[PDB]
Symmetry: D2
Subunit: 240 residues, 4 copies
């Protein structure tokens, strides 16, 4: 039978390592979307949940003129990229995307879009379901920098779920990186980028570039190839 409270090295007690502040904020999490992932938690900014693109704007200025219908929105390649009105630093993000069942094209010209983190660093979106391409630029790559850990594609018609955790960089006075950005990317529950260091801007041509910036929007890419446009749904973001 026990007769006294146990103590540790030099008499330390369990209470001495029990703290009551800072209190983590209470968040009511979202629910599961059929064929998708989590909907927005109570402290998240809802960027899209089926109604409109009022949280977005054209990169050319003015309203975001992608097509909203049936609880999704669809890229209009004649209108170009759209971006969040709001700018971000560290964040967690959710976004779901669908390659249409009538998709055509090969390699980089088949359902190409992308999520530009702070407007600088592309997380590639592409139909890589039975579509080979260069591996450092396939789905879930940090475009042309970091090869994804897997190909976790769902087929056209189904929804590919991204969960993204992003840490923004800091810059020195002279414009060079003080700390690089880092990103974790999970696609359909599969980790594709595991705390990957971002080397600089994602570039189609040449080495990544070091360009000082502060907070930036999320930019969704209108890739001007002729492939049928992809659709998006259930986009939310919460600042970390």
């Amino acid at each position: 039978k026990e007769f006294k409270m146990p103590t540790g090295y030099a008499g330390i007690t369990h209470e001495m390592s029990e703290f009551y502040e800072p209190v983590p904020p209470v968040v009511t999490p979202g629910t599961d979307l059929k064929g998708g992932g989590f909907t927005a938690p109570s402290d998240a900014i809802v960027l899209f949940d089926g109604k409109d693109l009022s949280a977005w704007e054209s990169v050319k200025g003015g309203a975001a003129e992608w097509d909203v219908h049936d609880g999704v929105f669809t890229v209009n390649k004649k209108k170009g990229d759209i971006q969040t009105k709001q700018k971000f630093n560290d964040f967690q993000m959710h976004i779901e995307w669908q390659v249409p069942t009538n998709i055509t094209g090969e390699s980089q010209s088949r359902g190409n879009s992308g999520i530009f983190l702070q407007g600088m660093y592309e997380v590639q979106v592409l139909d890589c379901y039975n579509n080979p391409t260069y591996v450092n630029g396939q789905t879930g790559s940090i475009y042309k920098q970091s090869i994804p850990l897997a190909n976790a594609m769902r087929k056209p018609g189904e929804w590919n779920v991204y969960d993204i955790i992003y840490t923004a960089p800091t810059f020195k006075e002279d414009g060079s990186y003080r700390t690089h950005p880092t990103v974790t990317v999970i696609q359909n529950g599969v980790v594709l980028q595991n705390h990957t260091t971002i080397l600089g801007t994602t570039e189609w041509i040449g080495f990544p570039q070091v360009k000082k910036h502060g907070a930036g929007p999320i930019i969704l890419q209108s890739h001007g190839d002729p492939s049928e446009p992809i659709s998006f749904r259930n986009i939310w973001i919460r600042e970390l």
Copy 2:
């Protein structure tokens, strides 16, 4: 009108940054479980999907004697902790848990369990839905080391979803840490640990301890307080 392929610094072409190996493995992802998260992808080890605990054993040796029923398994506190037969290093993990609707108790004595990563580092499981406790030991904490970024609890009866990404430590010859373990923890889609460094063993009493180890099992905690036992479902793990 275009008349030549664009080039970058010193004539670099887009092809010179396009690589076709190493090819990421093709994984068929799982589906969404109603009220939960993702089921196991094709390359994952299924630790539980409703049938039995054949992937587990008692920490005392022999069969894992927690109670399997209705597609879940329920802690039997008289039997003690259970652990995976298999040992792991770096991994991604999924696990869902339910506080029963008739739960009773306060603070650390209310639906207390936990996931010991490699058998050494507890990710706390606890009913913190309207139940205050010490914040460095509440739900999703790295127990008594790292306070979770939020309280993202679902109420009793509903399923709390964990997605965990873990990097194992390396040890020096003298037994000290060469690299510390790191962990990301997401609960119901909300990030609770963002690439958190683990300082050593999780301890109820005293400072974290530095104890050299290699690969270790996942241990699920039977916390011997009188509260009604929690239930688990949809457990899978994939090695990174």
Copy 3:
């Protein structure tokens, strides 16, 4: 010329900006280490403590003599007038030949990085103490990789490379500070993560701060005071 994958040439990976600044390095001090490079702030090179102040306000009243300065325990801690974030630092210190005392009460001083995080200074030449608080420790957090002490009378050389933390809006750490410490050419802290304030009692504390001075510790035990020389700092 030879070419690589898809015809890439050696010129395509040769960049001419940004140009690293030209620094004239210092020289070697006999019995010590490097003197200040041309872009460094000279905190002490034998003349005076004009770069320092008392933590109580006013002049730094430690005793300058013979090209060194010596702790005056009756006056308390001194600190740099200037505040710093990321930096590289050099500092040399001498335990006097007539030193007395044991454990933490034998030539105890310290370098508080941004005023918050102590790199321990102590005479650990044939003087055991608690290992997480011995010379070159991040005090009571990180045990040094070695004991690289020179004996009393000789000069112990610190080279320190420090990365400042960032803080979240709620006051918690966004990124922790990191520090490398080299004593007499031997690495004692290898890119060590600092957990919070260094504390004699209790767990490290998380206290939001910006730029901070370098504070040199006057530890009020009765041991004979240590002396300092060749202190410089350059911002990173």
Copy 4:
């Protein structure tokens, strides 16, 4: 006796193990830096190259004289017999006073960490070149934080702290290597991540390896050969 949160006492955060090993540090070399501490492997201190071998197999046939050794470009690279993982390293090098050449063809050598990752050696005293390949660069990957050259005839001092990578089963990096480089007391690489092999042509390559030697480069341009002294390494 003062106490902290929930009555915690100062003794409860005072640990007496693990005890850091006692190391007798080296001394200061005139015009250079620290000589080898007692636990360091002495790779060169003036006598011979018995710790080295030709990369082609057999004896290292660079020329030992006057307490230094000098590159013989007809013989090619030399490397340590011993292989290393994590380490701290010291190495001093001299551009001869009669040096000639421009850009990469002027006193070019280098230290290949584990045989894979070049820390550039070059005479960049009034000699411009591409900045990502100048002195103290991680060759063509990471531009050094400064140009801290001493002139020809004088000794440039490197202190290097290196963490080896780990590799996944499929041959990709699990953890990248990191390196700190200090030249003549000035930090040139501050815990820099190495991206892969250093390459004259193309992107850095990911090639699985274990422990590797230190390789010193014989760069086959016609410039007068550089000399080395005071090389030591200690495992971390």
